[PDB]
Amino acid sequence: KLKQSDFPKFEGSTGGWLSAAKNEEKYVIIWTSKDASLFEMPTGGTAKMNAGNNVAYFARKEQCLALGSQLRGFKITNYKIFRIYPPLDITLLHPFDGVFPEKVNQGRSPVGKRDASIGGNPNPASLKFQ
Template sequence: ITWTSPKAQVYELPTGGAATMDEGENVMYFARKEQCLALGAQLRTKFKPRMEDFNIYRMFPNGEVQHLHPKDGVFPEKVNAGRSKANHNPRGIGGNVDPATVKFSGVTPKEVGSEGVAMMAASGEKV
């Protein structure tokens, strides 16, 4: 992970302990991406001014470097014009299928929600 700090500050390491960041460009090596994300979250929330310019890279033994986060230059919680929605369900909670009508029908709730299968109540009425 790399980041730029406006001043020298002490920060907590995700692996335990503390360290001092220098003013300007900083680099820290971790074994896992989750540890880098934890430090990045700390940089964005616990320091004033916020440090939003961190990048996470993966370095391979052959010297190749792969940029991991933020993948397209914009953080995942921000809106980006070219980004497609992930795990989006285009209905409110009131539009969900009643679980009691699906339980013994042999159809999974995911199939009901995605394909728009007409559900029948126990009495034979359409739901």
């Protein structure tokens, strides 16, 4: 019926990925579920989970993350999202250090932090021709 046994029991929708997620990048979300719960696809309609390993492919990181946020309502937490380039170039994305970004984990450095409030930003006229 389906290419892989771990795919959710989805009947296919004309809202899945397109030619872009065959030559630029595609995103895969994996998770393990205790029950074959019925959930709503980020793209189309209702799909059925597998009582075990579940693997879904999407065209955007936002679609995978919306599916994962929906999974949290099913008490599912072990979901992990990967980015796949045109060949099998798998990169773990969402649980980047194994801890969700909302929980503080040691080993993270601040990126994009300014040691002042908004009012300390430089005047644009002094940022001309650089």
